[PDB]
Design a protein around this ligand. Structure first.
Ligand SMILES: O=c1[nH]cnc2c1oc1ccccc12
Length: 167
């Protein structure tokens, strides 16, 4: 048993809810929250911007030190950093950004990072301002992640369409 509530069962291991990922983290304090990161860990807007704002910019300060030491992530890659006030850990995962011309086949590689963690609170990778089709992102998630993933979908309209169209 875990602390996630009202989540709507999609598969053996994948659950979904209409919730802003920032809000949900504050309530649950999950072991792992996933950030929709870019390779520079520049959390300007989007989930990264909303998560970072909720940490009072401490996520960005920690991320700038990580990049100064290690250099940029790979598209499809990840790093584990602090979860600050939101979670124990934040798994920063880089899905391909369609609005930058990145290979959508890298979305599967991105979701493979989730398999290193038994339970995660996550957004749909490459959705929102990353430009991919969220229906596609949910299909890759279900077909790639084997650990237990709790997806939050910010848009009530999109949350309804993802459920209704789910095969
Ligand atoms: O939370 C989201 N995940 C993936 N796509 C979207 C989400 O919120 C949105 C709001 C407007 C348009 C797309 C999205």
């Amino acid at each position: 048993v875990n602390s996630f509530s009202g989540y709507l069962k999609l598969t053996d291991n994948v659950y979904i809810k209409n919730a802003d990922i920032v809000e949900e983290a504050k309530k649950v304090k999950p072991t792992v929250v996933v950030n929709a990161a870019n390779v520079y860990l520049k959390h300007g807007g989007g989930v990264a911007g909303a998560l970072n704002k909720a940490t009072n910019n401490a996520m960005q300060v920690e991320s700038d030190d990580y990049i100064a030491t290690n250099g940029p992530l790979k598209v499809g890659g990840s790093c584990v950093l602090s979860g600050h006030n939101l979670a124990k850990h934040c798994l920063h995962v880089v899905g391909p950004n369609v609005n930058k011309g990145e290979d959508i086949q890298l979305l599967k590689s991105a979701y493979e990072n989730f398999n290193q963690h038994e339970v995660l609170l996550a957004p749909l990778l490459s959705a929102g301002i990353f430009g991919a089709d969220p229906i596609h992102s949910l299909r890759v998630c279900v077909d790639t992640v084997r650990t237990n993933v709790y997806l939050a979908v910010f848009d009530k309209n999109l949350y309804d369409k993802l459920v209704s169209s789910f095969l």
